[PDB]
Amino acid sequence: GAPATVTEQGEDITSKKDRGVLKIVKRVGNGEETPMIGDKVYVHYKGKLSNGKKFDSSHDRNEPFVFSLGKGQVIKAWDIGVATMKKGEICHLLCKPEYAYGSAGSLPKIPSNATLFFEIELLDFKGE
Numbered sequence: 001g002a003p004a005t006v007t008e009q010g011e012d013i014t015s016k017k018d019r020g021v022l023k024i025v026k027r028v029g030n031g032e033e034t035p036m037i038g039d040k041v042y043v044h045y046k047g048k049l050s051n052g053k054k055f056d057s058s059h060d061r062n063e064p065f066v067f068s069l070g071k072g073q074v075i076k077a078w079d080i081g082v083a084t085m086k087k088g089e090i091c092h093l094l095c096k097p098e099y100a101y102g103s104a105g106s107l108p109k110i111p112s113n114a115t116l117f118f119e120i121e122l123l124d125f126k127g128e
């Protein structure tokens, strides 16, 4: 499935090159620009625990998914990953626990040492 493709073909976009965040572009976006730290970003996404039993999607939201990039409003994997995206791009992102919830987890929703998988579409981004 999609996660297996990311493991075997994904790009390691981590600074440490530890394979903690692996990416595949599924749909190429527009232009060349990718967001800067402090930019407000607008996304649609869906996500899951790698090993089963919990699934999330922005399509269930009343309002669009918005956050300021690089400001620790989301897990590390997203601050790293969404920063690499172009407007319109859709990517798959596989996120090891060190870039997500760690050994602590976020119980009872997210267990200890969970790997997460996301499909992310960057709708737009704007300056601060």
Ligand SMILES: COc1ccc(CC[C@@H](NC(=O)[C@@H]2CCCCN2C(=O)[C@H](c2cc(OC)c(OC)c(OC)c2)C2CCCCC2)c2cccc(OCC(=O)O)c2)cc1OC
Residues within 6 Å of the ligand: 045, 047, 048, 049, 054, 055, 056, 066, 067, 072, 073, 074, 075, 076, 078, 100, 101, 106, 109, 110, 116
């Ligand atoms: C800097 O570190 C952190 C910053 C934020 C958090 C909180 C969870 C933080 N979650 C996340 O960063 C990641 C990436 C962005 C989408 C949501 N997300 C999640 O892990 C997903 C998530 C979705 C959640 O609600 C939609 C959620 O809130 C209950 C949540 O809490 C742990 C986690 C999970 C759900 C189960 C399947 C796997 C994905 C969060 C949730 C909801 C919104 C949000 O930002 C936008 C906003 O507030 O409107 C930030 C944890 C953090 O570290 C543990």
